[PDB]
Structure 1
């Protein structure tokens, strides 16, 4: 795909917003447009920079970040600016947190899977993201449109498939595991394996033994099936991302109002930690209503 060579004199850096998977993201202006620039900081992030630049350029999809171009002095990428911030920040970040609905949660997960499905259909070899998690998912258009960023692989223990941290023969089915966890996360508004915590290896061990995050009380069985399939030990028993996009598209019939921008605040307090099952943040009342009207 097309790319622009950037003169750094054409960039006016406004403020530093935070760090990506590598480097530093800064809000900027270029060609009088609102951009986000990602500067390398460690010089050891050179491999990551080359990988992201290599992938983002050939990738072209509504649910993957627009790469506008690159500047080589100093070494930085010029991408689109995400107004809403990361999905992680929307779920768990700074108070006051925005209120969101089951429709949003389902819509976000559909959009995410849409991007990943595109990546998995790349020619001649599939493109695996290898790092799917809410900090690498961005929200634009008032939090109604999701974009995948941070392709530096193409603190992640909670979203990683068991075969990945085992160094084993992993395929694109590891992305499917990640998506499974993300689905659980947006439904519950809980950090996966927050209960476990510790350092990384404590989660890795838990997941490796077959620990998955707790089941959700009152969750629809078709969503529950999809979720628990996505996080099977055997990679072959997980669905394809092509199948996930189709299933999720069809469930959106029972999730209307997904295009309503995040605007209402939320004062969020959490139920007891481990009961076996957890309460969803979102309400499935309307789902069940619209379902029984059809079925």
Structure 2
């Protein structure tokens, strides 16, 4: 049931690509008659020992997570460890928002925000820091239902600590991650703020997190991009209000980007502030 035999995975195509892996559309087809279910299967690429041990942790985390707003674990395949997950054909929210922009109103973006916030509230209850929350890592189950995916960089908080010192794009990172490699549930709140930005810009590439920040951080100097972003964030620079973003939603974004981790709201606090907008 939870064990998928390698030789019955029929490879269709590649869904998405990570730094140390890919997610492939496969049909698990034991009967050989093409009646089997389509599934999304992660395998490692360009992998050394460190990424292998990370993958073993990631499988166990995903396996232990049970939420309507978190992508479902199906099983694993050995032979060559592979992680089998539910296939959501509508794909990722990043592509979905660009594709269906003309039909997706503010109220629907708020639905997605609220569901992501719930998933993130659930993650915090399991003491799990996602570390790579972004629109590219949210999947569409239906028009009115999204789920958090990609637990490849996810860390369980130690039982006696609410932070972890430990690479995704720097433009979703909290200042304390940028500066001291510190990650926490409130580091995820910083990222969620950027996700809210993505939603309300419909993931338009002309005003993406990187496009906005890259423009702020000058042409070039003998200074790395990381230091210059940290400098701007310490000067109080933030992503702007998206075109036609509701005032109140932009204000929630700014609360997610409070300099101090303890001054950012909890997902539990954010949830009702998202749901009660416009009611």
Task: Determine if the TM-score, normalized by the shorter chain, exceeds 0.5.
Answer: yes
Corresponding position of 2:240 = 214
The structure 2 residue matched to 1:72, chosen from 56, 63, 78, is: 78
1:213-246 alpha-carbon deviations (Å, 9 max, x no partner): 0134665443233221111101111110111122
- Structure 2 unaligned blocks of 5 or more: 30-35, 155-167
Equivalent-residue separation in structure 2 for 1:160 and 1:128 (angstroms) = 13
Equivalent-residue separation in structure 2 for 1:82 and 1:20 (angstroms) = 18
Contact 1:121 / 1:127 at 8 angstroms: preserved in 2?
yes
Q: 1:207 to 1:22 in 2, by over 3 A?
A: farther
Corresponding position of 1:167 = 180
The structure 1 residue matched to 2:114, chosen from 107, 110, 113, is: 110
- Tell me the C-alpha RMSD between the 2 structures: 2.3
Greater RCO, CA 8 A, separation 6+:
1
Query: After alignment, is 215-224 or 104-113 more displaced?
Result: 215-224
Q: Which portions of structure 1, spanning 4 or more consecutive aligned residues, are displaced by more than 6 angstroms?
A: none
Corresponding position of 1:49 = 55
Q: How does 1:93-104 map to 2 (within 5 A)?
A: 98-99=101-102, 100-104=104-108
The structure 1 residue matched to 2:201, chosen from 172, 179, 188, is: 188
Equivalent-residue separation in structure 2 for 1:222 and 1:20 (angstroms) = 34
- How many residue pairs align between the two structures? 244
Equivalent-residue separation in structure 2 for 1:42 and 1:218 (angstroms) = 42
Does 1:62 pair with 2:88? no
**Aligned with 2:184: secondary structure?**
coil
Q: Greater share of helix residues, 1 or 2?
A: 2
Contact 1:21 / 1:152 at 8 angstroms: preserved in 2?
no
Q: How big is the shift at 1:97?
A: 5.4
**Aligned with 2:172: secondary structure?**
coil
